[PDB]
Design a protein around this motif. Structure first.
Motif, PDB file in Angstrom:
ATOM      1  N   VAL A  89       0.809  -1.213   0.000  1.00 26.66           N
ATOM      2  CA  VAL A  89       0.000   0.000   0.000  1.00 26.66           C
ATOM      3  C   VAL A  89       0.857   1.285   0.000  1.00 26.66           C
ATOM      4  CG1 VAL A  89      -0.396   0.277   2.492  1.00 26.66           C
ATOM      5  CG2 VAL A  89      -2.216   0.893   0.856  1.00 26.66           C
ATOM      6  N   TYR A 135      11.510   5.319   4.524  1.00 25.62           N
ATOM      7  CA  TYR A 135      11.119   4.774   5.835  1.00 25.62           C
ATOM      8  C   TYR A 135      11.039   3.247   5.861  1.00 25.62           C
ATOM      9  CZ  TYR A 135       6.475   4.682   3.536  1.00 25.62           C
ATOM     10  OH  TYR A 135       5.436   4.477   2.660  1.00 25.62           O
ATOM     11  N   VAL A 148       4.895  -0.600   3.493  1.00 21.74           N
ATOM     12  CA  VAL A 148       3.704  -0.925   4.268  1.00 21.74           C
ATOM     13  C   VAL A 148       2.812  -1.822   3.426  1.00 21.74           C
ATOM     14  CG1 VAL A 148       1.662   0.003   5.523  1.00 21.74           C
ATOM     15  CG2 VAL A 148       3.855   1.331   5.494  1.00 21.74           C
ATOM     16  N   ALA A 195      -2.371  -2.207   9.142  1.00 18.45           N
ATOM     17  CA  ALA A 195      -1.199  -1.842   8.336  1.00 18.45           C
ATOM     18  C   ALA A 195       0.045  -2.468   8.976  1.00 18.45           C
ATOM     19  CB  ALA A 195      -1.061  -0.333   8.274  1.00 18.45           C
ATOM     20  N   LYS A 247       4.146  -2.512   8.690  1.00 22.26           N
ATOM     21  CA  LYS A 247       5.295  -1.803   8.119  1.00 22.26           C
ATOM     22  C   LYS A 247       6.573  -2.534   8.431  1.00 22.26           C
ATOM     23  CE  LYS A 247       6.775   2.116   9.947  1.00 22.26           C
ATOM     24  NZ  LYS A 247       6.654   3.594  10.228  1.00 22.26           N
ATOM     25  N   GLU A 298      11.285   5.612  17.114  1.00 20.98           N
ATOM     26  CA  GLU A 298       9.950   5.355  16.546  1.00 20.98           C
ATOM     27  C   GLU A 298       9.236   4.291  17.372  1.00 20.98           C
ATOM     28  OE1 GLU A 298       9.626   3.842  12.446  1.00 20.98           O
ATOM     29  OE2 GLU A 298       7.428   3.984  12.511  1.00 20.98           O
ATOM     30  N   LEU A 344       5.801   4.918  19.588  1.00 20.09           N
ATOM     31  CA  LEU A 344       4.582   4.150  19.280  1.00 20.09           C
ATOM     32  C   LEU A 344       4.153   3.286  20.462  1.00 20.09           C
ATOM     33  CD1 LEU A 344       5.112   3.153  15.570  1.00 20.09           C
ATOM     34  CD2 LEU A 344       3.150   4.494  16.442  1.00 20.09           C
ATOM     35  N   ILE A 349      -2.404   7.641  16.977  1.00 20.68           N
ATOM     36  CA  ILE A 349      -1.927   6.349  16.430  1.00 20.68           C
ATOM     37  C   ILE A 349      -1.259   5.511  17.531  1.00 20.68           C
ATOM     38  CG2 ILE A 349       0.306   7.263  15.587  1.00 20.68           C
ATOM     39  CD1 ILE A 349       0.560   5.119  13.564  1.00 20.68           C
ATOM     40  N   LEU A 390       6.176  -3.220  12.353  1.00 20.63           N
ATOM     41  CA  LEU A 390       5.236  -2.540  13.235  1.00 20.63           C
ATOM     42  C   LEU A 390       3.849  -2.688  12.686  1.00 20.63           C
ATOM     43  CD1 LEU A 390       7.280   0.749  13.541  1.00 20.63           C
ATOM     44  CD2 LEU A 390       7.271  -1.115  15.162  1.00 20.63           C
ATOM     45  N   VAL A 391       2.884  -2.848  13.594  1.00 19.33           N
ATOM     46  CA  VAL A 391       1.486  -3.066  13.195  1.00 19.33           C
ATOM     47  C   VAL A 391       0.562  -2.055  13.851  1.00 19.33           C
ATOM     48  CG1 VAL A 391      -0.468  -4.696  13.005  1.00 19.33           C
ATOM     49  CG2 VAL A 391       1.922  -5.568  12.936  1.00 19.33           C
ATOM     50  N   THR A 392      -0.312  -1.448  13.046  1.00 23.02           N
ATOM     51  CA  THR A 392      -1.328  -0.523  13.556  1.00 23.02           C
ATOM     52  C   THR A 392      -2.650  -0.738  12.801  1.00 23.02           C
ATOM     53  OG1 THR A 392      -1.722   1.760  14.240  1.00 23.02           O
ATOM     54  CG2 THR A 392      -0.905   1.419  11.986  1.00 23.02           C
ATOM     55  N   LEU A 451      -5.411  -0.327  10.143  1.00 21.96           N
ATOM     56  CA  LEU A 451      -5.411   0.126   8.765  1.00 21.96           C
ATOM     57  C   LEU A 451      -6.333   1.333   8.689  1.00 21.96           C
ATOM     58  CD1 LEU A 451      -4.298  -0.319   5.923  1.00 21.96           C
ATOM     59  CD2 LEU A 451      -6.300  -1.803   5.441  1.00 21.96           C
ATOM     60  N   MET A 452      -5.788   2.449   8.237  1.00 20.06           N
ATOM     61  CA  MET A 452      -6.586   3.655   8.114  1.00 20.06           C
ATOM     62  C   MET A 452      -6.843   3.949   6.652  1.00 20.06           C
ATOM     63  SD  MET A 452      -4.093   5.220  10.767  1.00 20.06           S
ATOM     64  CE  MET A 452      -2.916   4.352   9.727  1.00 20.06           C
ATOM     65  N   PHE A 489       2.902  10.773  10.270  1.00 23.26           N
ATOM     66  CA  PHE A 489       3.187  10.513   8.843  1.00 23.26           C
ATOM     67  C   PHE A 489       1.915  10.641   7.993  1.00 23.26           C
ATOM     68  CE2 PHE A 489       0.839   6.628   8.554  1.00 23.26           C
ATOM     69  CZ  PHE A 489       0.910   6.081   9.812  1.00 23.26           C
ATOM     70  N   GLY A 490       2.095  10.742   6.674  1.00 23.60           N
ATOM     71  CA  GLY A 490       0.984  10.739   5.704  1.00 23.60           C
ATOM     72  C   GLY A 490       0.949   9.459   4.882  1.00 23.60           C
TER      73      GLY A 490
HETATM   74  C1  G97 Z   1       8.989  10.595   6.088  1.00 23.05           C
HETATM   75  C2  G97 Z   1       8.582   9.410   6.699  1.00 23.05           C
HETATM   76  C3  G97 Z   1       7.339   8.838   6.418  1.00 23.05           C
HETATM   77  O1  G97 Z   1       6.596   9.409   5.612  1.00 23.05           O
HETATM   78  N1  G97 Z   1       7.033   7.702   7.057  1.00 23.05           N
HETATM   79  C4  G97 Z   1       5.905   6.972   6.946  1.00 23.05           C
HETATM   80  C5  G97 Z   1       5.013   7.066   5.863  1.00 23.05           C
HETATM   81  C6  G97 Z   1       3.869   6.256   5.809  1.00 23.05           C
HETATM   82  C7  G97 Z   1       3.602   5.343   6.836  1.00 23.05           C
HETATM   83  C8  G97 Z   1       2.464   4.518   6.834  1.00 23.05           C
HETATM   84  N2  G97 Z   1       1.568   4.557   5.826  1.00 23.05           N
HETATM   85  C9  G97 Z   1       0.346   3.969   5.868  1.00 23.05           C
HETATM   86  C10 G97 Z   1      -0.440   3.782   4.812  1.00 23.05           C
HETATM   87  C11 G97 Z   1      -1.535   3.184   5.290  1.00 23.05           C
HETATM   88  N3  G97 Z   1      -1.382   3.036   6.616  1.00 23.05           N
HETATM   89  N4  G97 Z   1      -0.280   3.495   6.956  1.00 23.05           N
HETATM   90  N5  G97 Z   1       2.278   3.671   7.868  1.00 23.05           N
HETATM   91  C12 G97 Z   1       3.157   3.615   8.896  1.00 23.05           C
HETATM   92  C13 G97 Z   1       2.989   2.729   9.955  1.00 23.05           C
HETATM   93  C14 G97 Z   1       2.446   1.456   9.728  1.00 23.05           C
HETATM   94  C15 G97 Z   1       2.298   0.541  10.770  1.00 23.05           C
HETATM   95  C16 G97 Z   1       2.702   0.918  12.045  1.00 23.05           C
HETATM   96  C17 G97 Z   1       3.260   2.176  12.285  1.00 23.05           C
HETATM   97  C18 G97 Z   1       3.405   3.092  11.238  1.00 23.05           C
HETATM   98  N6  G97 Z   1       4.256   4.395   8.908  1.00 23.05           N
HETATM   99  C19 G97 Z   1       4.496   5.255   7.909  1.00 23.05           C
HETATM  100  C20 G97 Z   1       5.635   6.058   7.963  1.00 23.05           C
END
Ligand code: G97
Ligand code: BOG
Length: 337
Positions: free
Chosen positions: A27, A32, A35, A48, A50, A68, A72, A81, A101-103, A105-106, A166-167
């Motif tokens: 996705v 970084y 994911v 999600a 990662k 990180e 978290l 989050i 890492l698991v969170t 899904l958004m 993050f975005g």
């Molecule tokens: C400059 C650094 C940067 O942009 N880092 C990003 C970017 C996206 C991350 C991300 N994305 C998504 C997509 C859908 N769910 N999470 N998901 C996650 C994430 C996913 C699982 C657990 C913790 C974090 N981390 C992201 C970190």
């Protein structure tokens, strides 16, 4: 006791994950890491997952990985989050190379919900209330976000909001003092960002859509006026004072004549958030008690965080030390209820 893992090629690397996580679908990817969306059969949640990229490649990577994971693991709040799981295929510190890492899904972020249209006042109250609720919590841990923007705000189909790490330009939501590299920031830098977000949700238009760095400041001062005498007393920079001195003064605009047709309580809150002087901006806790949020405010359920030990930030350690500390944190993880 150790889960059974399986192996699968995903974003052109082999992932090794517990069998509870099914149907991985890429996705997102970047420096970084990468994911995948997955289904967690143990909880019945869409998640999600990662896989960190190069987490121990250098001292800096290793300290970032640790940072990180510590952050978290600490955040346990409905509007922030959090970590559902953290795992490694490694059976010992010796073989520890990969971190997952698991969170939750958004699906969507705040941009998606608004899509340049006005939200209703009731909807704005609900969304801003949640952001402030999460900020009260983050700020109570002595953490400043510093980059709050719509893309960092996840919102599900029940309108439930979570603050992310993050975005569009990021600059549009940044406090003027950050734009000026002031370097001793107040937590109310985040309140500035909230004000910018709230104004856009009410009007359907970016409040300060600067074209470049100086333009951003120009648009800011047009709304909030040039610095007053009380604020100028607090500026140590010789160059800044002399520049500000040279500026033809503008008064602060009347927000009631700016946000036409808005709830007067919304206007009042915006005035309290978008004050040039950071010492005079309303705090997240104070804002939650503002009459604008009467239908949502509950002092019994606006929790604060446990103290967050950030002493590691000051430390200069070796790769293997940061790695060992990170491994300790993986091993000690306890999933939420
Ligand atoms: C400059 C650094 C940067 O942009 N880092 C990003 C970017 C996206 C991350 C991300 N994305 C998504 C997509 C859908 N769910 N999470 N998901 C996650 C994430 C996913 C699982 C657990 C913790 C974090 N981390 C992201 C970190
Ligand atoms: C012409 C541009 C003027 C920008 C003025 C922004 C003033 C922000 O406010 C300042 O924030 C500092 C923390 O960062 C505090 O130390 C100061 O006490 C506070 O007045």
């Amino acid at each position: 006791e150790r889960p059974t893992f399986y192996r699968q090629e995903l974003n052109k690397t082999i992932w090794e994950v517990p069998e509870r996580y099914q149907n991985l679908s890429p996705v997102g990817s970047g420096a970084y890491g990468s994911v995948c969306a997955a289904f967690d059969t143990k909880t019945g949640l869409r998640v999600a997952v990662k896989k960190l990229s190069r987490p121990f490649q250098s001292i800096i990577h290793a300290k970032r990985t640790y940072r990180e994971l510590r952050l978290l693991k600490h955040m346990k709040h409905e509007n922030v989050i959090g970590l559902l799981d953290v795992f490694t295929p490694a059976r010992s510190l010796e073989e520890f190379n990969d971190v997952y890492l698991v969170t939750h899904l958004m699906g969507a972020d705040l941009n998606n919900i608004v899509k340049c249209q006005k939200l209703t006042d009731d909807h704005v109250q609900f969304l801003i209330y949640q952001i402030l609720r999460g900020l009260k919590y983050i700020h109570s841990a002595d953490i400043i976000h510093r980059d709050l923007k719509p893309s960092n705000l996840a919102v599900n189909e029940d309108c439930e909001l979570k603050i992310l790490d993050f975005g569009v330009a990021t600059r549009w939501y940044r406090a003027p003092e950050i734009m000026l590299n002031w370097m001793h920031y107040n937590q109310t830098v985040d309140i500035w960002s909230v004000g910018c977000i709230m104004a856009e949700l009410l009007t359907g238009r970016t409040l300060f859509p600067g074209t470049d760095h100086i333009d951003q400041l120009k648009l800011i001062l047009r709304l909030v006026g040039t610095p007053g005498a009380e604020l100028l007393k607090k500026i140590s920079s010789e160059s800044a004072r002399n520049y500000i001195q040279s500026l033809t003064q503008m008064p602060k605009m009347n927000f009631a004549n700016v946000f036409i047709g808005a709830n007067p309580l919304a206007v009042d809150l915006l005035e309290k958030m978008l004050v040039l002087d950071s010492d005079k901006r309303i705090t997240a806790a104070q804002a939650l008690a503002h009459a604008y949020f009467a239908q949502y405010h509950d002092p019994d359920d606006e929790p604060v965080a446990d103290p967050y030990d950030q002493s590691f930030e000051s430390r200069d350690l070796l790769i293997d030390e940061w790695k060992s500390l990170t491994y300790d944190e993986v091993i000690s993880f306890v999933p939420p209820p």
